[PDB]
Write a protein that binds this ligand. Structure first.
Ligand SMILES: COc1ccc(-c2ccc(C(=O)N(Cc3ccccc3OCCCCCC(=O)O)C3CC3)cc2)cc1
Ligand SMILES: CCCCCCCO[C@@H]1O[C@H](CO)[C@@H](O)[C@H](O)[C@H]1O
Ligand SMILES: CCCCCCCO[C@@H]1O[C@H](CO)[C@@H](O)[C@H](O)[C@H]1O
Length: 266
């Protein structure tokens, strides 16, 4: 009955995921494998993609142009802010999240969204680059490496994490629970009702462990492997925030979106 109740719980998380995220891993893998995106690998193709592809954020809305590396950074911010919106609606579609007081909801999103973003990023990434523009573009990792420091350096660690994470071969139904476990985390600073959040987290983790038993019957040590990735994501986000601090200190002409300012504020 423990296993039975959690299975319905997992299906509710999965449906929240499918209702709220713009691209599934199923979709992304089908594009990345040829099951075709315009390849952006230098300045000329970058400019042609701005001219030819359809962007959710219209270029004229971006902050005034500065240079190629910054422009890429502004497109990174666009997508991170948009994923915060999607992660917020995902969390609110989980009844036990929506039952928490709104200030605890904000506390959980503040400290969890980047961990979740970097985990879901793996879905659109392979060893050679990542999808952009709703899957209609592909930006090469070697191009992103070619950008000037500090912008190249804030990008490459996410590729390293992603390629390792994708070796575990999670599908969307696993990711739904994994992401819900990252957001419903009782460790976050300043949480008001810690025992309640810890209870929800524990339910999700038990749902996840049983989900992996059914969906991945032949995988060894997969649930522990994913608990370790959750710890790896915390360190990736610590390092990311440290790099953001250096961009705020040393790249004073680069704008940072106000919502991201509030996330890094503390
Ligand atoms: C026309 O030419 C283009 C060239 C590049 C791009 C582009 C757009 C989006 C993404 C992206 O999905 N990203 C960003 C991203 C991906 C990998 C590594 C790092 C990285 O962003 C680090 C900085 C993010 C700071 C903002 C913040 O901290 O929230 C996902 C994390 C959300 C990547 C590249 C678009 C057009
Ligand atoms: C939907 C967006 C989710 C992420 C929002 C980022 C949270 O920012 C925080 O908002 C609080 C006000 O509620 C302030 O008290 C904090 O000083 C501030 O850091
Ligand atoms: C000010 C510097 C920020 C420059 C980067 C551009 C931000 O992009 C978009 O900003 C909108 C306003 O909130 C969000 O609604 C969108 O989701 C987001 O995609």
């Amino acid at each position: 009955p423990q296993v039975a109740d959690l299975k319905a719980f997992s299906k509710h998380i999965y449906n929240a995921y499918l209702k709220n995220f713009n691209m599934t891993k199923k979709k992304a893998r089908s594009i990345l494998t040829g099951k075709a995106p315009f390849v952006i690998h230098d300045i000329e193709t970058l400019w042609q993609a701005e001219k030819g592809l359809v962007w959710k954020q219209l270029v004229n809305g971006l902050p005034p142009y500065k240079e190629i590396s910054v422009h890429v950074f502004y497109r990174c911010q666009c997508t991170t802010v948009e994923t915060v919106r999607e992660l917020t609606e995902f969390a609110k579609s989980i009844p036990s999240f929506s039952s928490l007081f709104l200030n605890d909801q904000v506390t959980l999103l503040k400290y969890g969204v980047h961990e979740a973003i970097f985990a879901m990023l793996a879905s659109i990434v392979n060893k050679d680059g990542l999808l952009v523009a709703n899957g209609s573009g592909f930006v090469t990792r070697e191009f992103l490496r070619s950008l000037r420091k500090p912008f190249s350096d804030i990008i490459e660690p996410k590729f390293e994490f992603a390629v390792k994470f994708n070796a575990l071969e999670l599908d969307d139904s696993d990711l739904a629970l994994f992401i819900a476990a990252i957001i419903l985390c009782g460790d976050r600073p300043g949480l008001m009702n810690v025992p309640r959040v810890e209870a929800i987290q524990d339910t999700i983790l038990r749902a996840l462990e049983f989900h992996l038993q059914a969906n991945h019957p032949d995988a060894q040590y997969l649930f522990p492997k994913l608990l370790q990735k959750m710890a790896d994501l915390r360190q990736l986000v610590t390092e990311h925030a440290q790099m953001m601090q250096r961009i705020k200190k040393t790249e004073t002409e680069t704008s940072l979106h106000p919502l991201l300012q509030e996330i890094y504020k503390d």
